[PDB]
């Protein structure tokens, strides 16, 4: 146990978690595994052959990266098991499965079977007394504090805008495209190869992802940066060498506004937002213009909301009072809200009645955790 459990945020690329009652997810690390590739010549050296965490973020070009969750969907379940075990570690948990009424998140629009399999793991294998899993937006409602809102959370490999009302969103006003800067950086690398730069290796591409999170802006111009050309704002490698930029510095980040140009059946961020608004009522939209919530790391862009609002102006009807809530800790805001929910004793029927839960299964899967 009756102490501080853990709030666990997902992420196809970066998973997060932390002890309740705090304001920051105590442990955050990416969603992949690092396994080396060379002969164990010198005995007694770094052995174990499976790295996650500091050694993973340390021995970059010394391992083999493998993400088990794709499009927010885990397929290499065993790798996530080991990632969970990394969370269970003495560096992180120092606990057992039978010690806390832990919390976990899950984005909507997913088959229940994923959650079912996770429940099978954390209840058949792990003897967790109570493990709740909810959506990924009420958390943000707790963070913002408001009841009426339009929650947007730029995931590791997902995007989803949903308008909620007092913690009760429509089961239809749901907009989502599993996308992020991942393929953006991939296409950026494609540009680079058609500019003389191929970074096909796993970690080699992760450095490009650092560049993604480093030199990507969002201008408001339609073709000004396209007709012009930047002078390669030269940055330098951790390796210690030249890093040009090239005019294309906006082309990959500006692509998410019109991602269908890549041969995609998507709809576009602003259109996604508009459609979420369209699926709602009428008077509520008036309030929802004044209720805009942004979350995720892919929101961290130079001129992000400006071009987004320009698209809104060119698309949404009149009498709109835009109120974008885009603070710094948009990522932690989710974990913050989860910690707030974990700070509740009124969580009674929400917490899993483990024994009876296993005796029920499917029905209890559709009943207890949501």
């Amino acid at each position: 146990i009756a102490n501080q459990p853990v709030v666990i945020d997902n992420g196809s690329g970066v998973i997060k978690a932390g002890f309740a009652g705090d304001q920051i997810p105590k442990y955050c690390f990416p969603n992949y595994v690092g396994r080396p590739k060379h002969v164990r010549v010198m005995a007694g050296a770094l052995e174990g052959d499976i790295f996650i965490g500091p050694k993973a973020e340390e021995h970059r070009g010394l391992l083999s990266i493998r993400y088990p969750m794709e499009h927010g969907i885990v397929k290499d379940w065993n790798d996530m098991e080991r990632i969970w075990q990394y969370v269970y570690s003495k560096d992180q948990l120092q606990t057992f499965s039978e010690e806390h009424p832990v919390l976990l998140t899950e984005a909507p629009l997913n088959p229940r079977k994923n959650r079912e399999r996770a429940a099978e793991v954390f209840f058949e294998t792990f003897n967790v007394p109570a493990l709740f899993i909810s959506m990924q937006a009420v958390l943000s409602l707790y963070a913002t504090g408001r009841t009426t809102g339009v929650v947007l959370d730029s995931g590791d490999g997902v995007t989803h805008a949903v308008p909620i009302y007092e913690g009760f969103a429509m089961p239809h006003s749901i907009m989502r495209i599993d996308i992020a800067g991942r393929d953006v950086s991939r296409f950026l690398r494609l540009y680079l190869r058609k500019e003389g730069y191929d970074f096909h290796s796993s970690s080699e591409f992760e450095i490009v992802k650092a560049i993604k999170e480093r030199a990507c802006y969002l201008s408001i111009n339609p073709q000004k940066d396209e007709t012009l050309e930047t002078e390669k704002a030269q940055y330098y490698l951790p390796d210690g060498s030249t890093i040009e930029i090239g005019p294309s510095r906006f082309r990959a980040p500006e692509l998410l506004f019109r991602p269908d140009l890549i041969g995609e059946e998507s709809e576009g961020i602003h259109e996604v937002l508009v459609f979420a608004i369209q699926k709602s009522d009428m008077d509520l939209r008036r309030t929802l213009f004044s209720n805009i919530v942004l979350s995720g790391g892919s929101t961290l862009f130079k001129g992000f909301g400006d071009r987004l609002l320009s698209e809104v102006k060119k698309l949404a009807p009149k009498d709109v009072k835009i109120r974008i809530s885009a603070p710094q800790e948009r990522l932690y805001s989710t974990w913050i809200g989860g910690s707030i929910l974990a700070s509740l004793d009124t969580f009674k029927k929400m917490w899993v009645s483990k024994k009876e839960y296993e005796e029920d299964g499917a029905r209890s899967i559709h009943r207890k955790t949501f």
């Binding site: 140009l261 890549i262 041969g263 059946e265 009428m282």
Partner: protein, 278 residues
Amino acid sequence: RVSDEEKVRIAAKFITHAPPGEFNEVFNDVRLLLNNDNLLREGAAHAFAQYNMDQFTPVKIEGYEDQVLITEHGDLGNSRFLDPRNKISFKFDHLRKEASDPQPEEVDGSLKSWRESCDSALRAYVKDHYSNGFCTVYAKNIDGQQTIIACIESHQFQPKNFWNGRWRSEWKFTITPPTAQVVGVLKIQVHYYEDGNVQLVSHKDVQDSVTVSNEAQTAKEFIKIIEHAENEYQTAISENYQTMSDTTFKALRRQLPVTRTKIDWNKILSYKIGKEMQ
């Protein structure tokens, strides 16, 4: 000079094909097109009668207040309906719910006792599980076979955003001892008209057979079968919407080019891409 007799079939077609909710208002508009009530009522009376009998038009006597539905098993033709539960004969107007003079009739009445608990459990599930879903089970001992007549109406008519929609369905448990039959037909009529036409019409009609046991077994049996079939087909409709997005649209209007990415119009304007190679 057009013959006004044609207008009788015109307004009759208008009455019959009118979706629920969108009937009296535009019907009055049809009168405005005709400027006469007598010419209208030349065939509009019979049209009113049958159009209400089939659309499960909601009717409610004050003596029972079960919110019965306009059909043929209570009807007498003289604007006088009968209670499918306490067999009262009572006059009932049709442009409004003006009902009077309850007269409890007499028939074999055995089946009535059966449909009492049948409609009780059925109506209990339908009320506690469908918002405006409300049923009425008529009963008739025609051709030596008892008839359980389930009529379900469900609507929400608030066209403030130019929308309407109504569910109706009739399922007959033809009690033919020993093996009774599960007969039935659905009815869907939804309509939206704020900048775009939406005319949703669908149904499903099936029949099964099983031997009569008692009242409770057959009650839960028949209602459970229809219940699951309706929920099942409702799920099928949801999946039909799923089949729309991917098949139907792309079966007619595709989303992407042959290269599935973009369209260079100037490349269409010139170059002659290789239209003479093969």
